[PDB]
Structure formats: C-alpha cells, structure tokens
Amino acid sequence: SATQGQVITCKAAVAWEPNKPLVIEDVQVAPPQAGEVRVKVLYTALCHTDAYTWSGKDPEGLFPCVLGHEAAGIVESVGEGVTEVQPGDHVIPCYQAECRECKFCKSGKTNLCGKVRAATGVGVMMNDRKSRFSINGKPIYHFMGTSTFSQYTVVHDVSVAKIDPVAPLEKVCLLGCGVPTGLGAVWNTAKVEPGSIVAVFGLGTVGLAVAEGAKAAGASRIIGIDIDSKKFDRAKNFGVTEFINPKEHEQPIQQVIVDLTDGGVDYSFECIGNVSVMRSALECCHKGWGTSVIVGVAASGQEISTRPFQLVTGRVWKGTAFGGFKSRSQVPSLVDKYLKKEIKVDEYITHNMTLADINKAFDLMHDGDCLRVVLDMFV
C-alpha cells in the first residue's frame, strides 16, 4: 500500500483541554508495532463515555487526547505477529480486549480481559509504553485503547473484532459499545427467563437495547422509567410495554413499581449512571428473587447504598461491563445477527454528521434530544 510502514498524517478531533471545543488537527499516526493494528476509521459514533472524559470530571482523564470508542473501519496495516486480521479486513475496535488466554478469558465466568488495561488506561500502547499520536513531535494520549476520533488509529490486536465485510460500517460502529451492553445485560448478565417482569431505568440507547434484549428473552412486561415523557413513544418499538415518569409521583419510584407489580420486578436495569436511581432499581425488585443489574457508569467517587435486609430477603445486586460479551469472539456474532435481521442496530442512530461537525454532535448529545450520532470520518 501507500502508507504501510510509514507515519500517516490524517485528520483527528483533539481534546487539548477539558471542557473546551474539540479541535480538528493534522496528526501524525506512527506505524503499528508488534501485536498492533492500524485502522482506517470510516465511521465513529459518540456517547456519554466520551463526554465524561472531555468534561474534566474524569480522574483518569489525560490531556491532550484523541477521544472516541465506538467505530467501524478497515485494517490499513498490521504489526509484527498479527495473524487474526490482515490489511483490508473490516473491523470494530473494542474498548474491552479479549486476549483469549489470561485468567479472565480462560475463566468462563467473565469478559473482563486485563491483558492491555495497564497501557490503555494511561493512553499508551503496550509494546513501548508510548502513544502512536503526535502533533509537532509531541505525544497525544490515546483513549480507551480505541481513539476513534482519528481517521487512523492504532489499537492492540486483542481489541480488534474481525467482522463480515458486507456489514454497513456506518451502522455496525454501534456494536463496540451501547447496543451489546444493553442486549448482554439481559442475555448474559441477568439471564432473563421467559415471562419475566422487567424494569428499565433510563430510555436512552442503552435502556432501549435492554428493552430489545428483554423482548427477545420473552419478558411478559417491560416497564420503562424516564424523567422525560417524550422518550416514551419511541420506546414502544424497542419493546417497552408500560411507562412511568418519576416526576409524576410523590412516592419513591421503587414504591410505584412495587405497587404495579405485586411486590416488585423480577429484573431491573439501571441505564443512567445515577447512584440514587441504582438504589431505587434494587429496591423495586421483588423479595425472594428480584435482581437489579447496574448498567449505568456512575461518576467516580459516588457510592451506592441500601439496607442489607434487602439482600438478606432475596434481592441480588450485580452489574454489567459491555453486556458480558467477549469482544473478538462475540461482536462478529452480533454483526451476523444484525445482518440476519435478528437484532436492531439502525434504529438507535438518530443523526449522521461529519468529522468537522464533532462539536455540534456533542452539543446535540448535551441537549439529550437524540440517540446515537454517527460521524463520517472521510467526507
């Protein structure tokens, strides 16, 4: 190819400082080293995770950085010893790695591979503990091991899911975050049985995928809870059967739910990242067997609380990370399901913009009057 083994110069949205507009820059992208993959990022979506770090409220935040973690693209080059992917392969770079060999991958009880976490957590690559991005010979931090706000990114091979090349890249970029998180919270983490009564707190992309997962599981009732009643109508198509706006009830939300379900739900899913709501989601579960799954990522430092009698009396408290899906092994299977029209993906995208419109997409996300916004990186 033209770029193989060479430093690439491309466009990237750089966050020089927290809480300031992103700046589209020309960046240098170093070639991939051993166990690395350089990806042409065709489309990137954005989510609250990108905004949390950009805001300056993330203690793990490192500036200047290239944000972004939901993307689909094409392998431009591979580093030494890469064999699962080759140039030209269609891929989804994932924030959750799957080395297949560690304690976690070989456990059979989790998807939390820790192989590259010490490097990705500090915005660098494992091979040399340095970033592959630079502006004027000065490094720019990676983010979540993905950095999808760059036209070309360098990621660890263990994070690269190889997907069907016929799959639309402007759609499947969602399968690296929200959609599998929501579906897997139901299918892998909770393991929702047919006939279950489900409560979904937060009717955004994540809560809507939980609703779709619970509908595929054959839940008898899917109760949708949101503080914005305008989000109720779009929710019906994702499987939500009933709605509650907590602002319309003086009594605690858990009490409303308990009153409507003869003691509480079989499964609840908190899809917001609000510690108060996480307690309510636990407490709205039925005595004896009710299970609350935390999906929402709460701001660092915040605590969840309840009275232990809640768990002594049969309620279970758990959480999910990427819906318990193993990235390399299972993300391709989700793309296959989507192609066979077995799962929805397109319905979670409300807007399509271009890389130059990054700030406008973040403002729209900040308004909260959209679902996923997909950006075309090469307009």
Instruction: Give the residue ranges of the annotated binding site for NAD(+).
Output: 49, 95, 205-206, 226, 231, 272, 295, 297, 320, 322, 372
| Known catalytic membership, residue 70 | yes
Residue 53 sits at φ, ψ, to 5 deg, of: -65, -45
Looking at the Cβ atoms of 131 and 310, the one nearer to ligand NAD is: 310
103 binds its own copies (CB under 8 A): yes
Say how many Å lie between the first and final Cα of the chain, rounded: 21
| Residue (217 or 277) nearer to ligand NAD, CB | 277
Task: Name the one residue in this structure whose structure tokens are 């949708």.
Answer: 224
> Residue 264, Cβ neighbours under 10 Å: how many?
25
Q: Which of 10, 65, 94, 99 is catalytic?
A: 99
- Concatenated DSSP letters for 51-115? HHHHHT--TT--SSEE---EEEEEEEEE-TT--S--TT-EEEE-SS---SSSTTTTTSS-----S
- By C-beta, is 107 or 237 nearer to its own copies? 107
Binding mask 136-165 for its own copies (x = CB under 8 A): ------------------------------
301 three-state secondary structure: coil
Question: Is 113 in the active site?
Answer: yes
**What character string, x for contact with its own copies (CB under 8 A) and - otherwise, covers 224-263?**
--------------------------------------xx
Q: Is 119 in the site for Zn ion (CB under 5 A)?
A: no
Among 68, 123, 202, 264, binds ligand NAD (CB under 6 A): 202
* Candidates 10, 65, 105, 284; catalytic one: 105
Stretch that binds its own copies, among 20-28, 60-68, 169-177, 300-308 (CB under 8 A): 300-308
Nearer to ligand NAD, 36 or 270 (CB): 270
Rounded to 5 degrees, what are φ and ψ at 109? -120, 0
Report which DSSP code applies to 150.
Answer: B
* Nearest-angstrom CA–CA distance, 33 and 40: 16
Look up 36 and say whether it is catalytic: no
DSSP secondary structure letter of residue 265: B
Q: How far is the CB of 208 from ligand NAD (least distance, A)?
A: 7
256 binds ligand NAD (CB under 6 A): no
Residues numbered 203-242 forming contacts with ligand NAD, rule: CB under 6 A: 203-207, 225-228, 231
In sequence order, what are the residues at sequence separation of 6 or more whose Cβ sits closer than 8 angstroms to the Cβ of residue 373?
A: 45, 46, 349, 350, 351, 352, 353, 361, 364, 365
* Helix (H/G/I), strand (E/B), else coil: 240: coil
Is residue 173 among the annotated active site residues? no
Annotated catalytic, 372?
A: yes
The least distance separating its own copies from the CB of residue 304, rounded to whole angstroms, comes to: 5
Please spell the DSSP secondary structure of 338-360, one letter per residue. Answer: HHTTSS--GGGEEEEEEGGGHHH
Residue 138 CB neighbour total at 10 angstroms: 10
* Beta carbon nearer to ligand NAD, 48 or 115: 48
Q: Is the peptide bond before 252 cis (omega within 30 degrees of 0)?
A: no
- For residue 352, what are the CA distances in angstroms to 47, 211, 364? 14, 24, 12
Indicate the residue among 14 and 281 with the shorter CB distance to its own copies. Answer: 281
β-sheet bridge partners, residue 287: none
| Stretch of 56-64, 92-100, 129-137, 308-316 lying at the interface with Zn ion (CB under 5 A) | 92-100
Interacting positions 305-324 with its own copies (CB under 8 A):
305-321
Structure letter (DSSP) for residue 351:
E
Helix (H) or strand (E) holding 333: helix 327-339
Task: For Cα atoms 205, 207, 209, give the angle at the middle one, nearest 5 degrees.
Answer: 70
Q: Which residues of the chain form contacts with its own copies (CB under 8 A)?
A: 103-104, 107, 109-110, 112, 262-263, 275, 278, 287-289, 294, 296-298, 301-321
Residue numbers at the binding site for ligand NAD (CB under 6 A) = 47-49, 177-178, 181, 201-207, 225-228, 231, 246, 271-274, 277, 295-297, 312, 320-322, 368
Residues that bind Zn ion (CB under 5 A): 47, 49, 70, 99, 102, 105, 113, 115, 177
What positions carry a catalytic annotation? 47-49, 69-70, 99, 102, 105, 113, 117, 177, 372
